[PDB]
């Protein structure tokens, strides 16, 4: 989920934008 | 610099990046 | 949520948003 | 400068991207 992807690991702008809307 | 986005900093970054019409978990 | 970007959080956000080939002050 | 614009006040993604490169 977003926490493993962006908090535990580091995510790019494009990855972060996948969780939008 | 710390590149990890956790907690309020993740929320802040989603809000910055997704903007208007924000985001979903 | 706090939308202000100061100090390391500003640096982190520039690095996130500008990416590769980062940024200038 | 960027600190008045994004730290003192709140800046948008587009404003922040003006300081890139």
From Swiss-Prot, chains A, D:
The chain holds residues 90 to 110 of 110 of the full protein. This is Insulin A chain. It comes from the Eukaryota. Disulfide bonds join 6-11.
């Amino acid at each position: 989920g977003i926490v493993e992807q962006c908090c535990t690991s580091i995510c790019s702008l494009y990855q972060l934008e996948n969780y939008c809307n | 610099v710390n590149q990890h986005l956790c907690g309020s900093h993740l929320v802040e970054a989603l809000y910055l990046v997704c903007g208007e019409r924000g985001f979903f978990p």
